Design a protein around this ligand. Structure first.
Ligand SMILES: [Mg+2]
Ligand SMILES: [Mg+2]
Lengths: 435, 434
């Protein structure tokens, strides 16, 4: 196929003011553009992001090298192979084999993904179907599902300057009648939350973090949960909103125990065992509508994850545990460590591998939650992705900052286009096919 | 040339509030535009139509504006069979159909959404880029990349610090290109974050609506010194200058000005307009301050006139002028200011925005194209500032993608123009001068 006419890459700025890769692919159908969300340039289990490391330029975060790899090498090689733009698997296989390394470190995981994404968009256009339909086709899925959105509205953990140890406190409008109404509920709860924060914590307490949520200066994770409850009740949706958490416990594990005040000066006297931590989670589940907990234990604390899951009935999500990595996921499945995969496309580095990972988790009875990264762009690919993959759940920010709202707005447009055939996952978010 | 379909919807803006988006289809494809937040009440600007259902999005829905497009305005425009390239006749048609002075029959947000989508379609019909079509509509032969003005330290009425003045901006006028202006701006921003974190704490770096920081400070001199520190740490003291938006109407009190207006009332601390002017002269003498927006109250005309005559910097109307032709004519006649802030949604059509810019430039004024606090993923104003050749745009800190979307589009425009691209640089006030 001579469908692919031109491939050009550039450096643009992400939502945090750091460089990332953008790729334009041209065919007879037009120009197809995709950008890559920030990832990791080091790490043992994820695909390697290539960063320039020039400390005098963008504080070492340039992506000139990755961009050059596309313009000079990867792009020309792909165009010369004359592959169909609709054959996502063959295209991704070619790029993976040309790179030839397990972690995409020859060209950069960011270089390969940028191309992979643009090809996918062009493939949908060649077939004359929406991107969300092409993705479903690629996943062998006859149907399409609008996800429940999970909004990270109260923020703690390593990147927030409060004492609050747990990372993400999310609201999920599972009781909404449609995706459009899930956005209304989400936004109204957020607006009421801001007013509660201004009153209780001060006129200086309402600026936002990287994902659009708030970081009031609190320590108690129960106090964060009570704020969500207060905002839900203030908006008048107690019957329709549930809560999801991301603990990110690897961030506070030390010498075999867990520190829920780890942003205060070192003091092992305050550390708690994994067993006491599990008891705290059970109290959350009893006292609040907590339906999902991500990274409850450290990434290597396998026996503790396995024990915990056997005694609860909620969703337990792997992020640092699994890292969108086949070998790690296989360990988790075999050890029954968790029951939901967080899906970050840039951690694995191709559209095909991301789809494969989703389908394998689903075949083992797990849920899948599609995820943003903290460095996002105006790109909306992951909205079409979650719909075509039929997962029933996405986290892509508070309803604030347009690198977040761009995805939520796109999900609204997708539901609009589907008309009276649209299905919203609602209370079946964990598995939209459940009876 | 023919318009085939027009369809409007409600989307969420960058602060989580509804706004209007319009799709216009022609033989060339789909052309999509969204409207930034504005004002539903006011004497001098076009009226944004909000639903006012207090139970739905806290009264901020735009169902009525959207339905005005789908049910009335859209079908009326289509029936008229106008060329999508004739921006002037299209906008005239919609303005006369509405028939009010402030666009309050259909809503300024309804009219503007259609106006923007028509302009994008018309560029394609003519075989030229959007920025070139705008330059054609404005009568400009050349294209100019603007200096970006990044709002990196925030105060005034919508931050909870004591800092009375509203916006502290950095402008990389000494950059070699737009691409390098972005690199300088971003590096300064990252160094500023570190400076603020070390001085004011780990909890001091969350961001406002436009992506900037609100450290808990009182002194406007301390805001300026923070910029100086960040600029020096980044290594660009010879290439970055400073702009300010005072928004002085926010702290005008019974004929005087209160630079600690968020602290408990005490009229003994209030200062005269003359004293406030002397403070600005100190900023200009001791820091590289080159531009001040709304230095005085929106009705304090004599004080603006007197101040401008004794300073050689840029003085920008925002609340003074409100992108309103009658207000702008008064400011021209009185020599109140010498630069227009251009908010397309305050006037409500592309044609009137272009006319306002041209009238300002014909009077020797500069023009700075501006975002709104509630923005979207739309990048129209990037193409707009390049076609209008104004040399200057303020559209956010280099943080939050409703801001970066515009900055990234300006880098793409520069890339498309190649080695012929002209960057305003040190001629930002008037790119045609010298
Ligand atoms: Mg996580
Ligand atoms: Mg202003």
């Amino acid at each position: 196929s001579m469908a692919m006419q031109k491939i050009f890459a550039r450096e643009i700025l992400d939502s945090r003011g750091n460089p990332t890769v953008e790729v334009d692919l041209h065919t007879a159908k037009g120009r197809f553009r995709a950008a890559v969300p920030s990832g990791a340039s080091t790490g043992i289990y994820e695909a390697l992001e290539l960063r320039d490391g020039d400390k005098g330029r963008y504080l070492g975060k340039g992506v000139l090298k990755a961009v050059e790899n596309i313009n000079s090498t990867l792009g020309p090689a792909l165009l010369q192979k004359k592959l169909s733009v609709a054959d996502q698997e063959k295209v991704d296989k070619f790029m993976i084999e040309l790179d030839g390394t397990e972690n995409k470190s020859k060209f950069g995981a960011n270089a390969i993904l940028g191309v992979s994404l643009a090809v996918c968009k062009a493939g949908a256009a060649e077939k004359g179907v929406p991107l969300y339909r092409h993705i479903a086709d690629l996943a062998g899925n006859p149907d399409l599902i609008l996800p429940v959105p999970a909004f990270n509205v109260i923020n703690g953990g390593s990147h927030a300057g409060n004492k609050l140890a747990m990372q993400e406190f999310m609201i999920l409008p599972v009781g909404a009648s449609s995706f459009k109404e899930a956005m209304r509920i989400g936004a109204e709860v957020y607006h009421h939350l801001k007013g509660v924060i201004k009153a209780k914590y001060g006129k200086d307490a309402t600026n936002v973090g990287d994902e659009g949520g708030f970081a009031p200066n609190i320590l108690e994770n129960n106090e964060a949960l009570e704020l969500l409850k207060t905002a839900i009740q203030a908006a008048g949706y107690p019957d329709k909103v549930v809560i999801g958490m991301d603990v990110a416990a690897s961030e506070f594990y030390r010498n075999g125990k867990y520190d829920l005040d780890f942003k205060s000066p070192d003091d092992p006297a305050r550390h708690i065992t994994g067993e006491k931590l599990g008891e705290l989670y059970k109290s959350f589940i009893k006292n609040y509508p907590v339906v999902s907990i991500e990274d409850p234990f450290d990434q290597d604390d396998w026996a503790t994850w396995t024990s915990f899951l056997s005694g609860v009935n909620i969703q337990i999500v792997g992020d640092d545990l699994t890292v969108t990595n086949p070998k790690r996921i296989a360990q988790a499945v075999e050890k029954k460590a968790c029951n939901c995969l967080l899906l970050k496309v840039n951690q694995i580095g191709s559209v095909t591998e991301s789809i494969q990972a989703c389908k394998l988790a689903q075949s083992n009875g797990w849920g899948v939650m599609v995820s943003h990264r903290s460095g996002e762009t105006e790109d909306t690919f992951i909205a079409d992705l979650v719909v075509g993959l039929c997962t029933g759940q996405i986290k892509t920010g508070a309803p604030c900052r347009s690198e977040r709202l761009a995805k939520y707005n796109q999900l609204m447009r997708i539901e609009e286009a589907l008309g009276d055939k649209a299905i919203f996952a609602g209370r079946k978010f964990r598995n939209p096919k459940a009876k």
